[PDB]
């Protein structure tokens, strides 16, 4: 059949903010994950429920690639059962997650020496996001009891902050792209498979 769109998710120029993680429907393809192994020295390739090696000899019902750039000191939060600003308010994976997390350094691409403010992260929210949830809103978060409006104030602040990634910052503060391939393998019909 037709090859799988593993391009446009790894070879993309810019990825998306964490609060606007994009999902790409991957169906009716022959998933040849071998093109990822020789892509770059990933910092993390933790697969839950499946082994990275024994991955091209199976089929999946519908796989979704979640792309988003996170900070280095919070890459441990993109995993099952984790907690934190990004885990609770931006992107939360379920405890029963069955997929692979692919993280690698992107300081050479997503980090300008003047500040890449095009990547934002949600810091304040009145409730924690549920698994596979997105919040693209930009409403001012009321921390105090005083009413608020469309303008910031001493007690209601903006919900989205900017990660000022710079090449001079040390490890942990550098940008780290993430590709969370969510698998769902069961008796359901198979739309994507490996190279036989």
């Amino acid at each position, epitope marked *: 059949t037709n090859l799988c769109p593993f391009h446009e998710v790894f070879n993309a*120029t810019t990825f998306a903010s964490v609060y606007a993680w994009n999902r790409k429907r991957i169906s009716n393809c022959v998933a040849d994950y071998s093109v990822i192994y020789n892509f770059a020295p990933f910092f993390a390739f933790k697969c839950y429920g499946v082994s990275p090696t024994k991955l091209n000899d199976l089929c999946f019902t519908n796989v979704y690639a979640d792309s988003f750039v996170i900070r280095g000191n919070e890459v441990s939060q993109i995993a099952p059962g984790q907690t934190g600003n990004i885990a609770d308010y931006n992107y939360k994976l379920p405890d029963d997650f069955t997929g692979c997390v692919i993280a690698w350094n992107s300081n050479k691409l997503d980090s*300008k*020496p003047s500040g890449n403010y095009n990547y934002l992260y949600r810091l304040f929210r009145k409730s924690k996001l549920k698994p596979f949830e997105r919040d693209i809103s930009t409403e001012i978060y009321q921390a105090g009891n005083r009413p608020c409006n469309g303008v910031a104030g001493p007690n209601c602040y903006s919900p989205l902050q900017s990660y000022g990634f710079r090449p001079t910052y040390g490890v942990g503060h550098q940008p780290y792209r993430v590709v969370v391939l969510s698998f769902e393998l069961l008796h359901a019909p198979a739309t994507v498979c490996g190279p036989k």
Partner: antibody
Amino acid sequence: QMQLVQSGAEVKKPGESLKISCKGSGYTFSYYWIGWVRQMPGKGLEWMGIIYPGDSDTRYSPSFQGQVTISADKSISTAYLHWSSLKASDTAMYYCARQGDLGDWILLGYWGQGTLVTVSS
Amino acid sequence: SALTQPRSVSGSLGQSVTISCTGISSDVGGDNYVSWYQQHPGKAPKLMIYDVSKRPSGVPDRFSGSKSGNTASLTISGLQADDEADYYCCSYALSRVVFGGGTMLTVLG
């Protein structure tokens, strides 16, 4: 001020394996990408590749995967084009470009003067 | 993919002109990876449009752009003799930049 000068004209014959250079100044030649663009007589621009002076990470175009290699000497802030076994088709004005502080890492913001390479006999 | 660009275009001073760039790509993270470059005879390219919803610094405000599906456009709100140069569109969505064939604008005056 931010400047980006290239080597002078290089008239060469097939097989001499010349090298073009681009001397950058006015910025940190370690965090900004640097590449080259080809423009044959009368035709349009053609991208060849870029290199990150920090680490030897070179991204080439499918049409220039092995026809030419890009290198950068971070100690002197210079990028080079190394041709091996030149051909008569390599005649073109090669322009250097760098990232820029405006857009994405791949967007060419600032350009150079361009070096004319003539492969004739 | 490959971008196509009408080799030749025309216009009149004080009026406007449009350039078509078909073949724009797309990736996971954005779809506005379109930029335009100007190049006079015997000079180097000069970026004039990046992030089509945005403009560079120092470029006149009459160089605005619009996007329409897999096609982008460049509008010169007021043609002048200094605009008689080639224009190349670029698509840098898939980490590989692709230039067009150029559009030679011949202003009439």
